């Protein structure tokens, strides 16, 4: 159930799980249905607002309906923390086979990742 992302910042993230998806192969996001991802990280700060970019064939969109508190789903330097996060995809969301999802989070950024194998369908 682990999938391949890419660390934009300093390697704070160790892994990314998505129910149903495996590695770098097509990860299907069903419109009108919840989308669940489990992330764990070791951030290098003491302290958290969540910011999600997502491009859909190069329509670059900030995601609506994002609960942006990290401590509503979950911290100090030099230790791990686990987060199991759900975004509900609007039924009307555009379909695409070329999607890039970008997620990142007191004095700068905590963690960052880029996933390129999501496909929006149904």
């Amino acid at each position, epitope marked *: 159930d682990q999938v391949d992302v890419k660390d934009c910042a300093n390697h704070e993230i160790k892994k990314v799980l998505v129910p149903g998806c495996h590695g770098s192969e097509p990860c299907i996001i*069903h419109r009108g*249905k919840p989308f*669940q991802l489990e992330a764990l990280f070791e951030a290098n700060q003491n302290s958290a607002k969540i910011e999600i970019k997502a491009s859909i064939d190069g329509l670059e969109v900030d995601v609506p309906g994002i609960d942006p508190n990290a401590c509503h789903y979950m911290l100090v330097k030099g230790q791990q923390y686990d987060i199991k996060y759900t975004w509900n995809v609007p039924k*009307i969301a*555009p*379909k695409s086979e070329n999607v890039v999802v970008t997620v990142k989070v007191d004095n700068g950024v905590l963690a960052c990742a880029i996933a390129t194998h999501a496909k929006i369908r149904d």
Partner: antibody
Amino acid sequence: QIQLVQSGPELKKPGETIKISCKASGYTFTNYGMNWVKQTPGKGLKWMGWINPYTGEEPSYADDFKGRFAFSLETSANTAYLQINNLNNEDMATYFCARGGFTDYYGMDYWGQGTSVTVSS
Amino acid sequence: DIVLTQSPASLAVSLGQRATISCKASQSVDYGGNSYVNWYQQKPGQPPKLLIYAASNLKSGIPARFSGSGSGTDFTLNIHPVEEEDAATYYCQQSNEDPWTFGGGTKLEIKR
């Protein structure tokens, strides 16, 4: 104040076309899918498919309504349409438009009053 | 096609008593923590009206006399206490995958 109002009942002859309308109001039209639903007096409810006003994409049809049926929009007028071509006796039914929930969790929450179509010479 | 079978097809219940309507799906309607079955009420000459969404959520403005439960392939609508205005036909319906399907329905008769 959310409402879906359909065009009135209609007698059509076998072979003719009908364009049934479904005007929406009281919500942001482009944020919700519009589903079509067929009911025949004898029988129950059959989901025909749906159209997406956010994307303007090609509509999705259930197997029994591929080819003779066309869902369409006039988005500036908050209006969804169901055109049925080459009408036959089996098309004689009541057709409902129904708004899809913002996500699938919320069900088809608001329904038109229906449009009873009679097919007869 | 997900087939939805209602049991019973028809039911006669006295005022103040319980009406129990089962809906059986031919495969699971669960996805991502939710169960995608909704319950509708249709009175003669009228459009279906949604009572319950995602198996167990009571739609606003519907009294708590109506009660939805279940997950997976087995769903239940309970109406308790039954009242005169409940004379109608009730449909379950699944939004798990295309094509969305309705059950054949249950006609509720009020015993007097």
